[PDB]
Design a protein around this ligand. Structure first.
Ligand code: CLA
Ligand code: CLA
Ligand code: CLA
Ligand code: CLA
Ligand code: CLA
Ligand code: CLA
Ligand code: CLA
Ligand SMILES: CCCCCCCCCCCCCCCC(=O)OC[C@H](COP(=O)(O)OC[C@@H](O)CO)OC(=O)CCCCCCCCCCCCCCC
Ligand SMILES: CC1=C(/C=C/C(C)=C/C=C/C(C)=C/C=C/C=C(C)/C=C/C=C(C)/C=C/C2=C(C)CCCC2(C)C)C(C)(C)CCC1
Ligand SMILES: CC1=C(C/C=C(\C)CCC[C@H](C)CCC[C@H](C)CCCC(C)C)C(=O)c2ccccc2C1=O
Ligand SMILES: CC1=C(C/C=C(\C)CCC[C@H](C)CCC[C@H](C)CCCC(C)C)C(=O)c2ccccc2C1=O
Ligand code: SF4
Ligand code: SF4
Ligand code: SF4
Lengths: 73, 157, 73, 80, 42, 143, 73, 743
């Protein structure tokens, strides 16, 4: 039970990490300082500046649901 | 000498001419199918298409359905074919409702492969498609009835 | 499939299918009233996540109840 | 169609116009920068949204911005 | 010679030599002191 | 002042056997495009739709389905070969619309007869927060 | 078993939605001037601290919990 | 026009100066790293020679030396194999009791309890059971003592040294010329007759002098130490005549054309030798002789310097018809200019050849006591299948590379390729429809059977007992094979293989070797599944190749390169449009095909062939013939195959097979680890690394090489690499544990 509860802590912490990083970087980041102008859900910002796939806060939610399912699993 | 040529001599139209596409046997046979008789009342063309498909659909439903080995009721599996004709007659009907409007003309080509002007097929018209659905339904249920009417002296009944 | 494979592959594939329909006799008498296109990038992430989650929930619900109610204890 | 905007941080290197694959960008005379020219987007009806122009902007932050908007036949890149 | 020594200082080669020496040391430690779930010397 | 050249039909087209990447019903009911160029000699050039075609000597006319296909072919006509090119849009009514080069000058070269469109006069980071345009049909970049 | 599993997955989805709409608030409704130097704007002011430490805790938990499981395996 | 030897002297100086400069080959990479992405590019473009320069001669010399290095590494690998067979193995014990001893050639050190992996393999030996099959090869060749394996390992080490030296020589010293590489006629002549012909002849010479006599003595039960040395059969021919009488003549029937005498050791009996379970060694030697003659003849088709012979250019140009225009004209100039085209062709053919090897080695066991070593056979089959699949995916990749980089109709035109490009749309649409039809009419049948078995309707399924779908064609073909000896093959004494001929069950040491393989509704369904998966893989790869240059979505895709992420979120979205991403998806689909293939093989062999035979002839298979009823269902594949046969790997803890139990879960781990990359994009990860960099810069410990998340292409590459590694290693552990335990 000690080992499983720490896996639970891992699941809660990482799922929180994904959602919080997406919620705080939703208005802007060093990579896209004007993300708030593009809305909540958009595909990306193009292949420029190195590549910006899954950079919106909607994608942060989308990544966190996998971790939510894994945690509840 | 080469066999493959551009579609009607135009290389920048997205197609080619091959023995499958442009051949006297294929051109005549397709020109004589009821869907390509662009000068015939669509009700009659629907009757033929309905008769052919309603007749064909009975075979698979009867020989593959669940009651296939219960010969007491398996021959009545044509009802399933008739039900599909009903469903397809709905699919045909709802198609024309959305595609063509009452006052809209025909959307079919008004030209010929040789350039001369032509009268467009009335099948791409609201009333023309309505006659085709009505013809397909009438021939469809008639094809299912006529197919089930025959049952004996066949190697796969 | 929706999460690994991405859009551009399916868009070019749908283009090759649109040509096929326009050049096929008999069937070309039927015209689509909405142009066939590949699912949006964000739509693909959502559809893939929904299949993932539905399979997640249904697989575990089936195992949970069958392994427990099969013994009832 | 997609919206495209040019901000006055533009230095006038004419790189967004060279990378554009549907001739949406133009170079007009201006007095703000050294090259005496700024970009403009007068033909966004042909814009496809490839953001190939943003990949070529040396300004930090970008001076071309492509805001993907209402999709049309031209913006979806359909040949059918 | 100097170029050869500069190659030996590259990241993968330095990593292999460093991790090989580290792997050998831990192997000998667990060879003279196998198992050990605790710090027994108190 | 510049005057765009009118589209002259019956202009020769490059030698090509035909491909499946050509026009579709979109050209019949929606729109299609036509690129024209001069060329010095008979050459081979890769088609933006299929394989290879023989560019006729003298005036050439080529009809495509998309505008991007025209500019891509034109850019290669300007790079590999040294050929000037124009292209237009053709609606099913028969109307023709001149497109590129708009001014007769290439768009990468500054021309004095051009007007600003969609040019915001501030830093990109000086846009407003989305709440300040809420319940309005505005965007923080349209201004 | 069915009831506990049902509510835990329900709660997992609800938690992902809570943080999703938190990000949606930051984009659509957050006015930075009317929240000047309060606790809400200060969350954005040190976003890197919050995200980095959430990352450290997830790394710590993940490294060790996995390691102990592999050791016992 | 005159084929001759052509090299240059000292083109590149031997120095360590360029060793110390990372990324020297590339002009952008040589400046050193500004960000971490550099570090990855240095490895991604390490072998992209045609992107380092445009001179075909430099490229060809680099490729030549790379081949020499590969041969050096392969010889070093073989040296290690023979040396482990000599020094840390029980080969001498397996040689006396091949039916009870488990072959083992690796012994672990006792450090952290891993000595448990040194399991009881028989012959007083504790080690790891090997499935490579080197024991069977060394027995077939006639090797008996550890000394001969020692000498073979030493020779392989010397040959590795020779290959490494030659690789240095033909790049830094006498480096060949472009026309030398381009002498295709001479090269094909020497590879058909000199390499393959003389190689087959040399091996036939060994087999008629060492393999046949030593193996006769091994079959007779003579102790291997009491067996005469091989060279004693080359001195006193009385020893060879006492086993094979025709050797008493002395090459006289060969020159006088009385070859009918040599039928004693050059036979056409076929089938299997019932004592060993392998093909008759006399038949294999006769085979190698015939192959040697055929290849020695075939190595004379192409002209060189003496007028007689063919020119491939003429043969190509002469083959043009009314459908394909002036086809084949121009192909000789293409295949003598582009390395990637040759690589595509050869990868395709070599991979398909590896698959053919996988089939032929199971259906016709070539080595003694191979057919009964179930672990070795299963491992060989699966390994060769994977090799072939990967090589074919690589063929696709390099075809696309040629399309992007070496294709140009204005310089090296070909009519066939242009015609293919002019209807790629029709080709791809038809392949798409075929794939949909096959997907419905194979897997849909499985879903039908599942839904009928779950609804309590076992007669409405597709089964050998209900709606039958018998593979009549394959059954008739194997029947025609069975009746061929004595009719359409009078010289053949038995059937080509045992899977053909009815009856004639060969068993060795209480275990079966081979018997006629049944073919029913299950085989039909599985073969159609295989056809469907192959078709979808072909669709992905070929569609990537044909649309590599242009498409209706991106008409200038060739300018973007062969390997690029996308072309923007516009046009609806352009992700994974490059041919590289088509290879990336074809990897997954090749995995999905090959896995079903090897699972079919495993279950079929464990259900209808492999098993234990009684003294009276009662054969009970490893699984009780459950293939006909259980494999026609997806739930049957889940339960009666996976859930049942994974027991050995989930129970291997505390035994010598526990390493497979560890690899099972580790491969599960890396497979699921790939899903993080395959389901995500690099923007989020860069935004995370931003805050992490803040944390580092706060404590004066941020690196100069600015950290950057993996590129999009690198994200997909890592994802597919880990996915493939995890899946294949999981199946590897499962197969090996299962077959070594129940074998
Ligand atoms: C089995 C699959 C798998 C695994 C192992 C991980 C693991 C991880 N994820 Mg992830 N994830 C997955 C699936 C997986 N994910 C999937 C399917 C998704 C949906 C797309 C996500 C989406 C996701 C997001 C959005 C995020 C993560 C994050 C993380 C990291 C959390 C930090 C941590 O716990 O410390 C470490 C835990 C580990 C399991 C590391 C194990 C590997 C160790 C180091 C092996 C040691 C190396 C050893 C010497 C082997 C030698 C190899 C040799 C070849 C060199 C972690 C490395 C978060 C993160 O980045 O954290 C900051 C993050 O934000 N994941
Ligand atoms: C964070 C995860 C983790 C942790 C905490 C441990 C912890 C431990 N492991 Mg383990 N292990 C792990 C992961 C982990 N492992 C993984 C992932 C694997 C799979 C590769 C293994 C495989 C493994 C094996 C095979 C063995 C262990 C063993 C051990 C124990 C030996 C301690 C020792 O070496 O003596 C003391 C060592 C030192 C004191 C060295 C420090 C001194 C330095 C070098 C110099 C000091 C200068 C002052 C120890 C309690 C051993 C054991 O027997 O368990 C009891 C053992 O045989 N582990
Ligand atoms: C009878 C003549 C002969 C023989 C035996 C070979 C044999 C071989 N060639 Mg080769 N070749 C020949 C003539 C020959 N070639 C001619 C006339 C040309 C055109 C001028 C070429 C051009 C050519 C190219 C471009 C390449 C090869 C390659 C190869 C190797 C292929 C890999 C392999 O099969 O592994 C099997 C391994 C063996 C069979 C071991 C035997 C190897 C022996 C020791 C080599 C002896 C043959 C050699 C030509 C004799 C001269 C060497 C001498 C001066 C010391 C192989 C060893 C590839 C390569 O370089 O691989 C490194 C390759 O890229 N050949
Ligand atoms: C490259 C393959 C190869 C090689 C190197 C040899 C080499 C040799 N063979 Mg041999 N042979 C071969 C293929 C080969 N053979 C094949 C394919 C056949 C089947 C037709 C034979 C059938 C054969 C016979 C019948 C005899 C030899 C004999 C010999 C030896 C006599 C040489 C001599 O002293 O003069 C010699 C070492 C003779 C022998 O045993 O001498 C001791 C002899 O009697 N060979
Ligand atoms: C004789 C066969 C052959 C040859 C000579 C080549 C040669 C080449 N290939 Mg190719 N390829 C092949 C087969 C071959 N390939 C096959 C069978 C496939 C199918 C998978 C591919 C798919 C492929 C792709 C998709 C690409 C190439 C590319 C290239 C070029 C660059 C190679 C490079 O530097 O990568 C560098 C090599 C590495 C970075 C090593 C990567 C590590 C591997 C992938 C994982 C290691 C796992 C290992 C097997 C086991 C795990 C051990 C681990 C735990 C330590 C080059 C000319 C690239 C190119 O740019 O084309 C011009 C390109 O993108 N190939
Ligand atoms: C289990 C997951 C899964 C499934 C079901 C599929 C299914 C399919 N893939 Mg896909 N794929 C997957 C995973 C999957 N893939 C993943 C993870 C990747 C990433 C590598 C890919 C990458 C990929 C590529 C690149 C391609 C495909 C293609 C295809 C299609 C092949 C044509 C076919 O077989 O028609 C038959 C349909 C099926 C076998 C699906 C099941 C159909 C059932 C049995 C019929 C039930 C009908 C029923 C009446 C429904 C009505 C119910 C109603 C009440 C709603 C097919 C539909 C190819 C394609 O586009 O087709 C040509 C193709 O290009 N896949
Ligand atoms: C001098 C090296 C160094 C130092 C001092 C630090 C220090 C720190 N790192 Mg870090 N890191 C490093 C290297 C280093 N890192 C490298 C190479 C990587 C890439 C794998 C990372 C990736 C990383 C992540 C993802 C995170 C940190 C974080 C942190 C902070 C929390 C502690 C921690 O989690 O560490 C953990 C250390 C690791 C996970 C990997 C360390 C690998 C080795 C042990 C360090 C390298 C030593 C170097 C090669 C020696 C050079 C020898 C020289 C004399 C020649 C902390 C201040 C966390 C943070 O943000 O703080 C809140 C966090 O999320 N690091
Ligand atoms: C090989 C079988 C294909 C026979 C093609 C029949 C055939 O060989 O005809 C031969 C025909 C004529 O070629 P030519 O006369 O031009 O040949 C002269 C030179 O090109 C050759 O030197 O080629 C074609 O028809 C063009 C390809 C179109 C045909 C594409 C159809 C593809 C479907 C094939 C898949 C169904 C069968 C699968 C087999 C398992
Ligand atoms: C009484 C008692 C006790 C105590 C307890 C305590 C101390 C409590 C608590 C608690 C808590 C403390 C809980 C919690 C939780 C939380 C959570 C779960 C969170 C959240 C948040 C969120 C989700 C957010 C969102 C957002 C964002 C993100 C941004 C924007 C804004 C908002 C807000 C929207 C004990 C046990 C000792 C003993 C017994 C008795
Ligand atoms: C297959 C696939 C397609 C092609 C999928 C398409 C074109 C969708 C086709 C859907 C058809 C119409 C059948 C859908 C059946 C649904 C079950 C019906 C649901 C409708 C209502 C109930 C909502 C993509 O467009 C794509 C885009 C980006 C990443 C991955 C992919 C991807 O994997
Ligand atoms: C996790 C992840 C990353 C992040 C992955 C990274 C950054 C891999 C690099 C991690 C290694 C461990 C850094 C290398 C560390 C050096 C070897 C130095 C270590 C010092 C010693 C221990 C050797 C992406 O960049 C990415 C990109 C596109 C799609 C998906 C993903 C994705 O899922
Ligand atoms: S590959 Fe990445 S950057 Fe390119 S379109 Fe797809 S999500 Fe956007
Ligand atoms: S997104 Fe592409 S098409 Fe639109 S303006 Fe920028 S470069 Fe031109
Ligand atoms: S790329 Fe940027 S800086 Fe250059 S001209 Fe265009 S807007 Fe100005």
């Amino acid at each position: 039970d000690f080992l499983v509860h720490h896996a639970i802590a891992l699941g809660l912490h990482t799922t929180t990490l994904i959602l919080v990083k997406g919620a705080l970087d939703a208005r802007g980041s060093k990579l896209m300082p004007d993300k708030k102008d593009f809305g909540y859900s958009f595909p990306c910002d193009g292949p420029g500046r190195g590549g910006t796939c899954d950079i919106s806060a909607w994608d942060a939610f989308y990544l966190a649901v996998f971790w939510m399912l894994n945690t509840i699993g | 000498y080469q066999v493959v040529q551009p579609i009607n001599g135009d290389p920048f139209i997205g197609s080619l001419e091959t023995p499958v596409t442009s051949s006297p046997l294929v051109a005549w046979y397709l020109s004589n199918l009821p869907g390509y008789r662009t000068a015939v009342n669509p009700l009659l063309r629907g009757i033929e298409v309905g008769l052919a498909h309603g007749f064909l659909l009975v075979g698979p439903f009867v020989k593959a359905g669940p009651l296939r080995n219960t010969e007491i009721a398996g021959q009545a599996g044509s009802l399933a074919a008739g039900g599909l004709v009903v469903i397809l007659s709905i699919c045909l009907t709802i198609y024309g409702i959305s595609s063509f409007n009452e006052g809209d003309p025909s959307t079919a080509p008004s030209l010929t492969l040789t350039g001369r002007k032509k009268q467009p097929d009335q099948l791409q018209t609201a009333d023309g498609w309505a006659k085709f659905t009505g013809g397909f339904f009438f021939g469809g249920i008639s094809g299912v009835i006529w197919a089930f009417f025959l049952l004996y002296v066949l190697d796969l009944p | 499939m929706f999460l690994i494979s991405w859009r551009g592959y399916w868009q070019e594939l749908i283009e090759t299918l649109a040509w096929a329909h326009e050049r096929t006799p008999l069937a070309n008498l039927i015209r689509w009233r909405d142009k066939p296109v590949a699912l949006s990038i964000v739509q693909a992430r959502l559809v893939g996540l929904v299949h993932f989650s539905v399979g997640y929930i249904f697989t575990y619900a089936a195992f949970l109840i069958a392994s427990t109610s099969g013994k009832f204890g | 169609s997609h919206s495209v905007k040019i901000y006055d941080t533009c230095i006038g290197c004419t790189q967004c116009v060279r990378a554009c694959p549907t001739d949406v960008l133009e170079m007009i005379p201006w007095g703000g920068c050294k090259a005496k020219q700024i970009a403009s987007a007068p033909r966004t009806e042909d814009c496809v949204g490839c953001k190939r122009c943003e990949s070529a902007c040396p300004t930090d932050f970008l001076s071309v911005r492509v805001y993907l908007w209402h999709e049309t036949t031209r913006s979806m890149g359909l040949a059918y | 010679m100097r170029d050869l020594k500069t190659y030996l200082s590259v990241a993968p080669v330095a990593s292999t030599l460093w991790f090989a020496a580290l792997a050998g040391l831990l192997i000998e430690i667990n060879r003279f002191f196998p198992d050990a779930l605790t710090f027994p010397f108190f | 002042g510049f005057t765009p050249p009118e589209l002259d039909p019956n202009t020769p087209s490059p030698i090509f056997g035909g491909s499946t990447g050509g026009l579709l019903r979109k050209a019949q009911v929606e729109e299609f495009y036509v690129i024209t160029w001069e060329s010095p000699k008979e050459q081979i050039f890769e088609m933006p739709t299929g394989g290879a075609a023989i560019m006729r000597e003298g005036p050439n006319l080529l009809k495509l389905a998309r505008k991007e296909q025209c500019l891509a072919l034109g850019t290669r006509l300007r790079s590999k070969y040294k050929i000037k090119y124009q292209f237009y849009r053709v609606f099913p009514s028969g109307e023709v619309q001149y497109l590129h080069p708009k001014d007769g000058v290439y768009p990468e070269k500054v021309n004095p007869g051009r007007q600003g469109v969609g040019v915001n006069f501030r830093s990109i980071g000086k846009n407003v927060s989305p709440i300040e345009v809420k319940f309005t049909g505005k965007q923080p970049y349209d201004l | 078993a069915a009831l506990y599993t049902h509510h835990q997955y329900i709660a997992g989805f609800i938690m992902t939605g809570a943080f999703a709409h938190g990000a949606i608030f930051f984009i659509r409704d957050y006015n930075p001037e009317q929240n000047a130097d309060n606790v809400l704007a200060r969350m954005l002011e040190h976003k890197e601290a919050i995200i980095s430490h959430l990352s450290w805790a997830s790394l710590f938990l993940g490294f060790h919990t996995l390691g102990l499981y592999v050791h016992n395996d | 026009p005159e084929v001759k030897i052509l090299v240059d002297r000292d083109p590149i100086k031997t120095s360590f100066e360029q060793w110390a400069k990372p990324g020297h080959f590339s002009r952008t990479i040589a400046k050193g790293p500004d960000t971490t992405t550099w570090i990855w590019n240095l490895h991604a473009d390490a072998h992209d020679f045609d992107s380092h320069t445009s001179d075909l001669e430099e490229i060809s010399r680099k490729v030549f030396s790379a081949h020499f290095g590969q041969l050096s590494i392969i010889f070093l690998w073989l040296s290690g194999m023979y040396f482990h067979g000599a020094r840390f193995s029980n080969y001498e014990a397996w040689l006396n009791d091949p039916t009870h001893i488990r072959p083992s050639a690796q012994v672990v050190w006792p450090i952290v309890g891993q000595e448990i992996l040194n399991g009881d393999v028989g012959g007083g030996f504790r080690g790891i059971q090997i499935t490579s099959g080197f024991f069977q090869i060394w027995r077939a060749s006639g090797i008996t003592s550890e000394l001969q394996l020692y000498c073979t390992a030493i020779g392989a080490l010397v040959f590795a040294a020779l290959m490494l030296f030659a690789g240095w020589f033909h790049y830094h010293k006498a480096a060949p010329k472009l026309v030398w590489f381009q002498d295709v006629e001479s090269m094909l002549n020497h590879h058909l007759a000199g390499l393959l012909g003389l190689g087959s002849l040399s091996w036939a010479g060994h087999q008629v002098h060492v393999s046949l006599p030593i193996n006769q003595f091994l079959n007779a039960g003579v102790d291997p130490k009491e067996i005469p040395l091989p060279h004693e059969f080359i001195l006193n021919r009385d020893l060879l005549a006492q086993l094979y009488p025709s050797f008493a003549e002395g090459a006289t029937p060969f020159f006088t054309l009385n070859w009918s005498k040599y039928a004693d050791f050059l036979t056409f009996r076929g089938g299997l030798d019932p004592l060993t379970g392998g093909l008759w060694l006399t038949d294999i030697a006769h085979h190698h002789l015939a192959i040697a003659i055929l290849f020695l003849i075939a190595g004379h088709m192409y002209r060189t310097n003496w007028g007689i012979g063919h020119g491939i250019k003429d043969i190509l140009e002469a083959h043009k018809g009314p459908f394909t225009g002036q086809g084949h004209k121009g192909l000789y100039e293409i295949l003598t200019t582009s390395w990637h085209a040759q690589l595509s062709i050869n990868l395709a053919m070599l991979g398909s050849l590896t698959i053919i090897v996988a089939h032929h080695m199971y259906a016709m066991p070539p080595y003694p006591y191979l057919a009964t070593d179930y672990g070795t056979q299963l491992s060989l089959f699966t390994h060769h299948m994977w090799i072939g699949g990967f090589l074919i995916v690589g063929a696709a990749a390099h075809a696309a590379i040629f399309m992007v980089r070496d294709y140009d109709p204005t310089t090296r035109y070909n009519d066939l390729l242009d015609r293919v490009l002019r209807h790629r749309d029709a080709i791809i649409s038809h392949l798409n429809w075929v794939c949909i039809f096959l997907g419905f009419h194979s897997f849909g049948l499985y879903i039908h059977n599942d839904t009928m078995s779950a609804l309590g309707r076992p007669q409405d399924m597709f089964s050998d007992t209900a709606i039958q779908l018998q593979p009549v064609f394959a059954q008739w073909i194997q029947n025609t094979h069975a009746l061929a000896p004595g009719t359409t093959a009078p010289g053949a004494t038995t059937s080509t293989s045992l899977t053909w001929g009815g009856g004639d069950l060969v068993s060795v040491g209480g275990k079966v070797a081979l018997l006629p393989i049944p073919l029913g509704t299950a085989d039909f369904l599985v073969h159609h599944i295989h056809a469907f998966t192959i078709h979808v893989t072909v669709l992905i790869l070929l569609k990537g190749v044909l649309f590599a240059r242009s498409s209706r979505l991106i008409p200038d895709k060739a300018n973007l390169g062969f390997r690029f992420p996308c072309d923007g979120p516009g046009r609806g979205g352009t992700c994974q449009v490059s041919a590289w991403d088509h290879v990336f998806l074809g990897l997954f689909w090749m995995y999905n095909a090959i896995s079903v293939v090897i699972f079919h093989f495993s279950w079929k062999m464990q259900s209808d062939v492999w098993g234990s035979i009684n003294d009276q002839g009662v054969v009970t298979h490893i699984t009780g013939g459950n293939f006909a009823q259980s494999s026609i269902t997806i739930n049957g594949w889940l339960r009666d195959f996976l859930w049942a046969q994974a027991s050995q790997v989930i129970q291997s803890y505390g035994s010598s097979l526990s390493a497979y139990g560890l690899f099972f879960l580790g491969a599960h781990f890396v497979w699921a680890f790939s899903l993080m990359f395959l389901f995500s994009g690099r923007g989020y990860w860069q935004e995370l690394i931003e805050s992490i960099v803040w944390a580092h810069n706060k404590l004066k410990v941020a690196p100069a090489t600015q950290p950057r998340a993996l590129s999009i292409v690198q994200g997909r590459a890592v994802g597919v690499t880990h996915y493939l590694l995890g899946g294949i290693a999981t199946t590897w552990a499962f197969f090996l544990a299962r077959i070594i335990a129940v074998g």
